[model samples]
Target: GPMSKGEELFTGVVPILVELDGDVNGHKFSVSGEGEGDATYGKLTLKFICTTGKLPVPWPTLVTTFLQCFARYPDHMKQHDFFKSAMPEGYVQERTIFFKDDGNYKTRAEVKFEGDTLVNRIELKGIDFKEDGNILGHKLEYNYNSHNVYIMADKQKNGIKVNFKIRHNIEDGSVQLADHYQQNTPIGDGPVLLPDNHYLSTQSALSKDPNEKRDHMVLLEFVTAAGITHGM
Candidate 1:
């Protein structure tokens, strides 16, 4: 055997793994994360497990929940400090409809707002199934600034208009919305509000064990800007 000039040798491989963990409103999101670039057997893998409230009616199920939540807790909006602080004006909430998508087995909700009241108009339409395109999921579009925050602001006079459009991927178990997109992406196209409390954390692997490798972690925490009205 001779030292060939064709192949190159290297030292120990660099095994890397990335895991994301966080908590929101009692919801826990833990996902498996991995990356590769060490040449041979280079591979990347990611697994996600988000434990949140199960949609009672699939994606379209949001429509029912949307309406029912408002109907049952109309005061929750009318008297909601966050909503009032966000909108700072009148608003309306209307009935929501669902659009069914057979390919994705999901539903889309389209809601319309007239004034700043809790009375808006909603219409549901089935998605147009295109060839070679299986419906991945459906997005729930709504005026978050008007529906979520404005309707829940503690202050009224200084309220701002912010809306949200949430998409639910039943197949992939992913829920995306305008807020999440803006926060996670480059463009800040979501609501504009002060953070009350923010936190983050990370974990790493220890050495001296088989299949063990290095790991990294990070965390964050902050609070919203409010005075006299709401305290910490």
Candidate 2:
């Protein structure tokens, strides 16, 4: 009835909750983490879909004019990243995400056996400024080199498992800026920057099994480039 082995299992849309800054917004980010259990020598999965509404507030003319006095197109975006945070009109039109990692994972990104002193590494290819869109879109593009990746392990039997579906590292890789013409699409568009370190784990306590815990967290800090004194 079913062909097994060499084939993976549990390929379902595992619902995800990306707690941004502290507000719960209406967004859909379907997930799949089925490869985390394929024993050693096997990969896991870490994929995502980001669909944002169109009509994200453009950089206010007030700020634009003000910045125009100082910085240029792309520079202005990161010069003061907060404007985007404040008017974050959901610029992302549509994007399919797939995380990639090749270094033998010490433990499967999807493993859950719990241990101490474990590590994880992931990266995003094709992260750059989209020069052709509404020049202003650069202000809304995500600019980080990679997600905030770090592990804090001092005590209390701490371990980590993105078990983030590795082998199937699959997801739509094409990213389109938000299109104003599309009803459900965001007019603003650009590549995405995954966030960095999070002190809090949003995993819930609804599990009957103490061994099980949901540990996905979010604080979309798109501050890709840097400082008032330095260059972007």
Q: Which candidate is the best by TM-score?
A: 1
The residue ranges of model 1 lying beyond 4 angstroms of the native Cα positions read 1-58, 61-121, 125-161, 165-167, 173-228
- Candidates in order, TM-scores: namely 0.23, 0.18
**lDDT per residue, candidate 2, 3-98, as tens digits?**
221111212211212211100112222221211211111112221112233212121101100000011113332322211221122222111222
RMSD of 1: 22.6
- State how far residue 191 of model 2 sits from its true place (Å): 20
lDDT of 1 by residue, 1-232 (tens): 2111111111113222323232322334333323221212221122112223332122222222121111111221122222222221222332222223322112122222123222212222323333332222223222111122222221232322222443433444444332211111101222323222211111112112234232211211111222223334
Give the Cα error of residue 47 in candidate 2, in Å.
15
What is the Å distance of residue 190 in model 1 from its true position? 31
lDDT value, candidate 1, whole model: 0.24
Runs off by more than 4 Å, candidate 2 = 1-79, 82-88, 96-225, 228-232
Q: TM-score of the candidate numbered 2?
A: 0.18
